[PDB]
């Protein structure tokens, strides 16, 4: 990455980089045909014969003496994976290398493996009573077996509906955001009061509020620093897609200093497949607790509700906690584009977004949204198509207005 | 649930009535249900082997499952006398036998191979039968005839074991990739039959593809090999046309049908509507008035031979007997036409059926007994390949290299048991080649068995002790050379932990393989292994310029089901996402003039070609025009049938 | 050699496959299914049917010139003759139709067009399911609905009782069983046919007055009218199916009613027949008729696979006896017990022909200035000897051979799959804890052999399971509840 | 901008040519030149050498009585309800009959058809008018009085309509699609109009109802031809305008491949000889000097058997082509940043059993795939132009990341060469 920096974001260097990228392949892939890498449990039964303490870690049960409880369970199993790890690493081994480089080792298997298999769900989701004592080197129960084929038909089922589910929402999140364009102008010139103020609470905010800029005591928007530490609990303003004041499109100021790196792109387009993928990833890795935010983030862009109820500095918060919650990372500037389509508002024209006082900030829903989008060619080639041809409630009759996807039909 | 509770080890214990598929996968006490499932859907999934052979650690129920299942024998019912012989071709016969108590006769046939489905089939080992002569009895175990599945003894085979170690090739194992040897892969043989029917009507007529003036073939003969991967063409003759066209008769022309295949003809099947006279005075179809007349000469044969069978009220028949006499009769019988598809046709209709062997192909897919699948990335000359060159087995090479990325992800233990297992049987034969006298070597060879499988050492033992002096050397001669085999229970029975603990603890001989240049020694090991059917030969659609639909765009077409087509060829259509992410580039002028240039628009397309066809070829400098694409024009006709209208701006 | 070894120790070895279960469909024989399918036509008086029989293939072809054709199209079938018989007007007509069907090859298979097609087992119910509110019996006719619902009633000092009814939905209409019973053998006839009659009285008002202090201290108190009301037994109250009886009874307690309407099976003719239709003159023909409907509910098969005892279901109404006396310990059972279900082959495969023959049964039913005679003639004339194969091979009751390679008695052989015709199985979530796995699975069906492309579509039965003879094909003889 | 709605009127529309009259689409087994199916006006199904194009438009007549458009009914039914009984003529008992004999007559508004509702339209709307709901529908209307009744009903291609003339095992059965069928039903009903040229109350008392029938059709026929033309992925809106089908592309299977760039990707020469069909057939023109069509002979025999000249020729070809014969890869269902690739060939596969993609390793994780098996395609880039436009498609412009601009790592490392790498450090 520093690299990229002293010697100009140019071409010639990001061709260098592949260059370079490709031969370190190669010469890996020599080096690691002449020197091997095999894997055998001898390694493990030689250990044990050297390490007494990994002997009896593997030679280990549950003591079912005494009753159980799954948060016991659960810590024990974890502190006997985090031994065998750590043994594991101290001594030498002919996996001492996969280890410490981690390609190609996951702990929870290895732990699943060679310490205790530990409970399975129900496919409702439910623990059984009766947890497998035994490890999968060691051996399995009849009733262990039951419960792992339990287990597996659950994993199937998840995978089948998980696949059914088809990648729906891409369509038309894609089909409304792809319209957004950027325009080469300096500042919009927006009004104060339009930036809009977000609250800090830790420094995951400041990571997703990097590359712009923020009014400092002399109001001078000075560039935000993530690794500063100063602006913990403070309310700033910000600038914004959702607040420029350009009606030809976004100006380089609202963009922040990413706006350079991106002139080739389809800002918005960008924008929306970046969160599409990882957001569909971490949900459907979910289904396979920590949902819940998920599909309250799924609610949140859809059902409108909170929108209804509330104000864009509120729902822009709400949106930057929720991606916190998620666990996905994404640049805000995406983010409040997205909100910047979002919006809506009676007046067409930006230029009384420059004044004091902004015009209604009304939003609604993402297919209602853009059925809203006075352009017909791109409602048309959405859904619900009936009712906008042969009813009058959208007035598909009146609304007109040019787009991308006007020049497709 | 109360259920789960109900269910006691004490109940199953010492029995598999809970486990089915399993049954054929060594050591279930490890793995996981993934790993179980995939390897289920595998064995659904197997296909035959040239040089099958029955796997080295067995489940004691690869017998039984092949003894019960009956599509691959045909095992006679009861003792029963053979009473004459039929030949069709030179590659098919046909026996009619009578029951030795039952008094009722019967009918066997064969044949090179046998079509299950589409490309998938196998060839016939018809030793048993072919050695058979006439006036011999028939004995009721005696087996006509079995799949290269079943070896001399009926014994199980569905993959073969193969030397296998685990190591990283110059980055190429990277995911699923397997690399294997050329020997091995000449050994993973397979073969692959398919039925292709052509029709030949009035208009149309074959060409002299095969053979010189006096050798008029239009199509390979049963000896013969297809050349060129073509099996025949039809000219469509026209009256007008037949003074160029059907010119030169021996050469086709630009404008014809063929028919694509490979492998050798295995039989041929000729139904014919048309009377004899014009096939008489056609040069153009000698050959197939040949094989007509052969066909014909046979049916009447076995139709003189059992008359004196079927008229005599007395006898005693199978349906199949009395259903294949009549098919005769009715071949025979004039007056007899035939409408295929509930439709009559003109001319006629004549089938072959085509066997060939294919060795590996780089791309296909191999597994082992517990799910471990992969794709063969690159095949080398085996020298060039890990080798251990040290000690008593200086100059041992591995065939295949599977992926040490992990195991430890896919979770299944069981295959290192499996290769470890095998590699310690190595090490025992070379000690026991090491041995002198009989009865030590034995010894010798029965206490590893003990060692790890007592019960099968006490059958050992008996069989040893049953065996005379001269055939227990003989037999030791086989151990030494092939191997030995070890029995592992699915569930209940196999291996731990503890006793390869106890294993390696008394065999300090045992030591990791040396192998030359390479810095770890790393360890070689027999795995069993099958092929499955997924080939990179099954999606292979490409096309450049094939049939439009009625709306003047690309569609796909039903040539390749006829063989009209060497390749599939159906063509790929862009969707949703395939334009957004297009569209990610600011240049929409660029995608439409591409969706334009390709199929929307006809006289784009057409100017496209003219354009590329001529020109300088490394330079394309297109020029595209304005004229308005079909799909807009078609999408105006909505419009305005609708009541609807077109008003730019 | 090690061949000879190989094969002599797998020949030790102890433990086996079932013989009996992989050469199962050679057992089959259509004639005994086919006649029930026969015999459902007996609804309508005018069919008389005679029997069937499979035709010998015996005949032989000899040398003829009728301009014969012979199609490559290959497939192997048997002839099979139904005779049924008519008589009108002292005329006598014996009906006799043909159908073709496909034979049995290489033990296990059929040869159709040509083609390779296999049967494989199909895996339903028993019978009594449970689902929703209401207590379900599957008939291939129709199954018989029992829906509960609340009451509460207040005694004569006001005894309020929450006590639940199970009203019968059948012939899409709510008839409760009672007045079933209740216009077949009166008041009385009902209460003694379940033995308890003696426990139930009823009185009118100042009738129920010179009832003593001591026969409610016996007997509770069930007010039927502003004037009438009955009386049962305290001890017979306390049990809950008692109560179920008495609510039933209650629902039956119309507010409009009179002492000789109590007292005459008539009045509940026409009360049945003002449920299935309010016009008077059809009350009394729609009730009677009706009732032998619901008489031909019952059919012979169903009574031979039931495991109940055949007292309790000599007739229909013996059947909805046993239902509704059993009737909360009936809802409580288990959804995926195999002893709650059973697998099926040679039924499925006539269920087109049985259609064919309820559709024409059904034009019989609606019968309406057509001679009997006539009406059986234009019946007994849609059916065609293609017809059976054509309906297999339209709704898929067979399976295409989509095997790869020789190894065919564990998937193909053994091979069931749950869904199938007359199924209910869909996308539902509760259809997804179908695709859940059942600990009773163990041991009679493979537990990881689910197709990838569907789980829990179809698996594969393990070779050890052994079905207990004369059972109709049940893996347990016995119910899941023996009621006991 | 785009296609814009408006209900224009027809007679200015209209052309004599296209007005059909009333025939069986059918005639002495053959199509009738004056029903749908005529060859006139209206195409050829079997040969496509019809000068005129498939987007003539059929045309039919009812002048006589203006009818109130189907397109306006349902905004129609929302100003006045129940505009369909209003329509609807049962005060009738000639032929009609008594029939219920009891019926709303709401101040006799209802049951007098289509030509009174018609004359009294205005008055209607004034009865049933909601300043406060139904103002802007009504505002619309007025907006809208020249197109409220059409008097010229048009017709689809019979070439674009699928409709066709099977011959059913029964007999020839003229399969067509229902539309043609209410079409059919339509200029036979209008027939009887034609048919009633003898004047008479009576027939009147029939012909009003047939105009009500008339209506009921129409609102049949859009519903219906908006059911399935244009609805949902099926229709035509979203199955072909957007995206459609492509003549010149490929797909394949990818395996790993070492000794080369991250860039360079091999494909297996029978894909190559198929894409670049045009090319080659140039070049060979070009070296032997003979027509085109003998040049097609030697490809044929080229991609029928393993031939060393012309794996030259194709050797040349892509050593001195200006882009290097770039084209895209697509792994479906593409739903990631840069699931599309520009990529550029680097080596012909010389084995010609080998049918596999090679691509580096590298590559995987960008476009999502696996070697397991997936299917991914490719579409190959002709004009310079677009090479240019798509070159912001290569992965050198992929290796910044868009999100936070630093080196990206789905072309970072991958497992297998991490280790080595870690070996060689540590
Ligand atoms: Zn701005």
Redesign the interface.
């Known amino acids: ?1 520093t690299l ?1 920096e002293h010697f100009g ?1 140019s ?1 010639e260097i ?2 260098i ?3 370079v ?6 010469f ?15 390694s493990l ?2 250990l ?2 050297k390490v007494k303490r990994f002997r009896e870690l ?1 030679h280990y049960r549950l003591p079912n003496d005494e009753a159980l409880e799954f948060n016991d369970i659960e810590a024990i199993i974890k502190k006997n994976l985090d031994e065998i790890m750590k043994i594991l690493s101290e001594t030498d081994n ?1 996996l001492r ?2 280890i ?2 981690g ?4 702990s929870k ?2 732990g ?2 060679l310490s205790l298999v530990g409970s399975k769900p129900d ?1 409702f989701g439910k623990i ?3 947890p497998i004592n035994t490890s ?8 262990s ?2 419960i ?10 998840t995978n ?1 509906q998980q696949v059914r589910n088809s ?1 729906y929402l ?2 038309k999140i ?2 409304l955001l ?1 319209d957004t364009k950027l325009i080469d102008l300096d500042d919009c010139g927006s009004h104060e009061n339009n930036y809009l103020s977000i609250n800090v609470e830790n420094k995951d905010v400041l990571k997703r509020f ?2 712009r800029s923020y009014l400092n005591n002399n109001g001078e928007l000075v560039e935000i620093d993530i690794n500063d530490e100063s602006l913990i609990g403070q309310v700033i303003k910000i600038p914004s897609p959702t607040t420029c004041a350009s009606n030809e499109g976004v100006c380089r100021k609202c963009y922040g200093k ?1 706006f350079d ?2 002139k ?3 800002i918005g ?2 924008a929306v ?2 969160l ?2 990882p957001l ?1 990833q971490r949900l459907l890795s979910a289904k396979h607790e920590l949902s819940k935010p998920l599909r309250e983030i799924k609610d949140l862009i859809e059902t409108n509700k909170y929108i209804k109820d509330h104000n864009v500095n509120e729902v822009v918060n709400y949106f930057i906690y929720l991606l916190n919650e998620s666990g996905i990372n ?2 805000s500037v995406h983010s409040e584009l997205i909100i910047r389509e979002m919006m809506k508002l009676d007046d067409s024209d930006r230029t009384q977004f420059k004044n004091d006082k902004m015009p209604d900030y009304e939003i609604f829903r993402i297919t209602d949204a853009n059925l809203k989008g006075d ?3 791109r409602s ?2 959405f859904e619900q ?2 009712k906008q ?4 409630d959208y ?3 009146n609304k ?1 207005k ?1 787009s ?1 996807l ?4 | 649930m109360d259920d789960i509770s109900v269910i006691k080890n004490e109940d199953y214990e010492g029995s598999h009535r809970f486990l089915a598929e399993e049954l054929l996968m060594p050591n279930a006490n490890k793995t996981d249900g993934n790993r179980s499932t995939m390897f289920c859907s595998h064995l659904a999934q197997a296909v035959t082997l040239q040089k099958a052979e029955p796997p080295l650690v067995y489940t004691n129920f690869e017998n039984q499952v092949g003894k019960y299942s009956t599509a691959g024998y045909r095992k006679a019912n009861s003792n029963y006398k053979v009473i004459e012989k039929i030949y069709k071709n030179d590659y098919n016969y046909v026996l009619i036998v009578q029951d030795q108590e039952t008094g009722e006769y019967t009918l066997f046939e064969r044949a090179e191979c046998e079509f299950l489905t589409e490309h998938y089939g196998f060839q016939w080992d018809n030793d048993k039968i072919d050695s058979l002569k006439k006036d011999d009895t028939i004995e009721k175990d005696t087996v006509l005839y079995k799949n290269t599945c079943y070896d001399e003894n009926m014994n199980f085979g569905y993959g073969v074991n193969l030397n296998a170690a685990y190591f990283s090739y110059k980055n190429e194992t990277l995911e699923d990739a397997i690399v294997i040897s050329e020997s091995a892969a000449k050994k993973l043989g397979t073969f692959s039959v398919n039925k292709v029917k052509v029709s030949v009507n009035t208009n149309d007529i074959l060409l002299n593809l095969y053979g010189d003036n006096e050798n008029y073939k239009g199509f390979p003969d049963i000896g013969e090999h297809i050349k060129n991967q073509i099996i025949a063409s039809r000219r469509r003759f026209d009256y007008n046309t037949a003074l160029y066209e059907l010119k030169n008769l021996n050469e086709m022309r630009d404008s014809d049908t063929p028919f694509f295949a490979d492998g050798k003809i295995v039989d041929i099947e000729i139904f014919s509507n048309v009377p004899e006279e014009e096939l008489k005075v056609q040069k153009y179809n000698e050959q197939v008035l040949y094989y007509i007349n052969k066909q014909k000469e046979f049916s009447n044969n076995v139709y003189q031979k059992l008359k004196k069978i079927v008229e005599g009220k007395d006898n005693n028949v199978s349906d199949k007997l009395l259903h294949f006499y009549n098919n005769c009769k009715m071949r025979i019988d004039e007056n007899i036409s035939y409408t295929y598809q509930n439709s009559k046709f003109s001319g006629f209709i004549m089938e072959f059926t085509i066997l060939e062997e294919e060795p590996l192909n780089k791309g296909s897919k191999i597994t082992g007994r517990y799910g471990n699948k992969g794709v063969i990335s690159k095949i080398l000359p085996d020298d060039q390949m890990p080798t251990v060159a040290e000690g008593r087995f200086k100059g041992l090479k591995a065939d295949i290299c599977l992926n040490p990325l992990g195991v430890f992800n896919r979770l299944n233990p069981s295959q290192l048991i499996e290769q470890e297992l095998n590699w310690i049987a190595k090490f025992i034969r070379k000690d026991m080649e090491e041995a002198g006298s009989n009865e030590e070597k034995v010894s010798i060879l029965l206490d590893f068995l003990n060692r790890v499988n007592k019960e099968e050492t006490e059958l050992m033992e008996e069989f040893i002790n049953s065996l005379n002096k001269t055939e227990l050397e003989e037999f030791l001669n086989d151990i030494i050379e092939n191997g030995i085999p070890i029995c592992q229970k699915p569930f209940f029975g196999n291996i731990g932990l503890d006793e390869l603990w106890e294993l390696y603890n008394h065999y300090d001989h045992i030591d990791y393989f040396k192998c030359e240049g390479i810095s770890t020694p790393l360890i070689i090991g027999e795995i069993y292994m099958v092929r499955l059917k997924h080939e990179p030969h099954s999606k292979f659609s490409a096309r450049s310029t094939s049939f439009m639909n009625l709306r003047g765009l690309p569609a796909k077409s039903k040539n390749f089901k006829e063989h009209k087509d060497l390749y599939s060829k159906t063509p790929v259509r862009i969707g949703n996402m395939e334009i957004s992410n297009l569209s990610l580039t600011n240049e929409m002028g660029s995608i439409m003039d591409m969706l334009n240039s390709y199929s929307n628009n006809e006289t784009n397309r057409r100017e496209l070609i003219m354009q590329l066809l001529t020109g300088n070829p490394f330079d394309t400098n297109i020029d595209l025009s304005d004229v308005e694409s079909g799909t807009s024009k078609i999408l105006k006709s909505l419009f305005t049938c609708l009541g609807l209208s077109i008003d730019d701006v | 050699m090690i061949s000879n070894f190989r094969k002599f120790h797998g020949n030790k070895n102890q433990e086996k496959f079932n013989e009996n279960l992989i050469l199962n469909k050679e057992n089959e024989s259509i004639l005994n299914y086919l006649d029930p399918i026969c015999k459902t036509l007996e609804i309508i008086p005018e069919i008389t049917y005679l029997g069937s029989s499979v035709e010998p293939i015996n005949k032989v072809y000899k040398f003829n010139k009728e301009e014969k054709t012979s199609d490559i199209e290959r497939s192997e079938l048997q002839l099979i003759k139904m005779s049924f018989l008519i008589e009108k007007d002292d005329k006598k007509e014996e009906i006799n139709k043909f159908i073709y069907f496909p034979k049995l090859i290489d033990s296990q298979y059929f040869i159709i067009n040509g083609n390779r097609y296999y049967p494989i087992y199909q895996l339903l119910d028993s019978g009594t399911y449970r689902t929703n509110k209401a207590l379900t019996l599957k008939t291939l006719l129709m199954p018989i609905v029992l829906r509960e619902k609340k009451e509460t009633f207040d005694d004569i000092n006001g005894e309020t009782h929450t006590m639940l009814n199970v009203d019968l939905d059948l012939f899409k209409s709510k008839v409760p069983f009672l007045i079933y019973f209740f216009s077949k053998f009166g008041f009385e006839g009902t209460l003694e046919y379940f033995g308890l009659q003696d426990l139930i009285h009823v009185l009118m008002k100042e009738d129920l007055d010179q009832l003593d202090e001591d026969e409610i201290n016996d007997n509770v108190i069930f007010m039927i009218t502003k004037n009438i009301s009955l009386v049962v037994d305290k001890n017979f109250f306390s049990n809950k199916n008692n109560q179920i009886i008495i609510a039933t009874l209650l629902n039956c307690f119309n507010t409009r009613i009179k002492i000789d309407k109590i007292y005459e099976k008539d009045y509940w003719v026409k009360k049945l027949g003002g449920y299935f239709t309010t016009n008077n003159s059809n009350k009394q023909e729609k009730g009677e008729g009706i009732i032998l409907s619901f008489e031909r509910i019952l059919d012979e098969w169903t009574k031979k696979i039931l495991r109940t005892e055949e007292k309790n279901k000599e007739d229909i109404y013996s059947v909805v006896r046993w239902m509704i006396n059993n009737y909360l310990a009936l809802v409580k059972q288990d959804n995926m017990n195999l002893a709650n279900k059973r697998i099926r082959l040679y039924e499925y495969l006539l269920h087109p022909l049985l259609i064919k023959f309820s559709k024409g049964t059904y034009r019989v039913l609606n019968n309406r200035n057509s001679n009997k005679f006539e009406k059986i003639k234009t019946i007994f004339s849609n059916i065609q000897e293609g017809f059976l194969v054509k309906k297999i091979i339209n709704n898929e009751l067979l399976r295409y051979d989509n095997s790869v390679n020789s190894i065919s008695l564990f998937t193909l052989i053994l091979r069931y799959t749950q869904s199938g015709p007359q199924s209910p199985f869909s996308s539902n979530s509760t259809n997804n804890k179908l695709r859940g796995l059942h600990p009773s699975y163990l041991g009679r069906l493979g537990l990881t052999s689910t197709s990838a492309g569907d789980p829990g579509a179809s698996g594969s039965l393990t070779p050890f399971l052994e079905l207990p003879e004369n059972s109709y094909m049940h893996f347990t003889e016995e119910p899941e509840i023996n009621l006991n | 901008m785009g296609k814009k709605l408006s209900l224009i009127d027809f007679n200015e529309i209209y052309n004599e040519e296209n007005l059909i009259t009333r025939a069986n689409p059918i005639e002495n087994h053959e199509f009738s030149d004056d029903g749908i199916y005529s060859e006139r006006i209206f195409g050829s199904y079997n040969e496509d050498d019809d000068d005129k194009d498939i987007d003539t438009i059929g045309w039919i007549n009812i002048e006589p009585y203006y009818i109130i458009n189907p397109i306006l009914f349902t905004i129609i039914k929302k100003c006045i309800p129940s505009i369909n009984k209003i329509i609807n003529y049962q005060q009738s008992i000639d032929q009609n009959g008594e029939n219920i004999d009891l019926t709303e007559e709401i101040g006799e508004d209802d049951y007098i058809g289509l030509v009174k509702f018609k004359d009294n339209f205005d008055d209607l709307l004034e009865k049933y008018t909601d300043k406060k709901k139904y103002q802007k529908e009504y505002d619309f209307l007025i907006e809208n009085h020249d197109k409220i009744f059409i008097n010229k009903l048009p017709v689809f291609s019979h070439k674009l309509r699928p409709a066709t003339l099977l011959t059913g095992s029964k007999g020839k059965v003229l399969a067509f699609d229902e539309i043609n069928n209410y079409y059919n039903f339509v200029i036979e009903y209008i027939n009887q109009i034609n048919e009633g040229v003898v004047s008479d109350d009576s027939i009147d008392l029939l012909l009003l109802p047939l105009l009500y029938n008339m209506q009921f059709y129409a609102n049949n026929i859009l519903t219906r031809i908006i059911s399935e033309y244009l609805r949902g992925k099926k229709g035509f809106l979203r199955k072909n305008i957007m995206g459609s089908r492509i003549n010149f592309s490929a797909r394949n299977v990818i395996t790993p491949l070492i000794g080369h760039p991250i860039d360079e990707v091999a494909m297996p020469y029978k894909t190559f000889a198929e894409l670049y069909k045009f090319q080659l057939i140039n070049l060979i023109s070009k070296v032997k000097g003979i027509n085109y069509n003998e040049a097609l002979k030697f490809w044929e025999k080229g991609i029928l058997g393993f031939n060393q000249e012309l794996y030259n020729y194709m050797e040349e070809l892509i050593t001195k082509t200006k882009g290097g014969c770039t084209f895209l890869l697509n792994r479906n269902p593409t739903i990631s940043i840069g699931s599309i690739l520009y990529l550029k060939i680097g080596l012909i596969k010389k084995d010609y059993k080998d049918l596999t993609l090679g691509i580096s390793n590298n590559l995987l994780s960008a476009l999502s795939g696996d070697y397991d098996g997936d299917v991914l395609n490719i579409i190959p880039v002709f004009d310079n132009k677009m090479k240019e436009h798509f070159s912001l498609l290569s992965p050198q412009n992929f290796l910044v990341d868009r999100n936070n601009g630093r080196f990206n790592g789905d072309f970072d490392l991958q497992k297998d060469q991490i280790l080595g790498i870690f070996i060689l450090n540590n």
């Not at chain 1, 990228?21 to 190669?26: F, R």
């Not at chain 1, 390609?103 to 996951?106: D, L, M």
């Not at chain 1, 999968?136 to 009733?143: K, T, Y």
């Not at chain 1, 006007?406 to 039909?409: G, M, P, R």
């Open positions: 990455t990229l974001y071409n990001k061709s980089i592949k260059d990228i490709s031969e370190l392949a190669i890996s892939g020599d080096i690691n045909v002449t020197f091997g890498n095999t894997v055998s449990i001898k039964i030689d044990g014969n593997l002919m290398y996969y410490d480089s390609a190609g080792i996951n298997q290895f699943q493996v496919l059984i009573p009766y999968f080197l060691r051996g399995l129960d009849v009733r077996f039951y792992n084929a339990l287990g597996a038909r659950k994993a199937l089922i089948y990648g891409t369509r894609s089909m792809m990097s590359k990413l790196i991106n080739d792109l389809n387009m960008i497949l970046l599409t993928d569909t994404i640049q352009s017909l060619s048309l080639l198509v009936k041809l042969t009813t009058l007035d598909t009759f007109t040019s991308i006007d020049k497709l039909l």
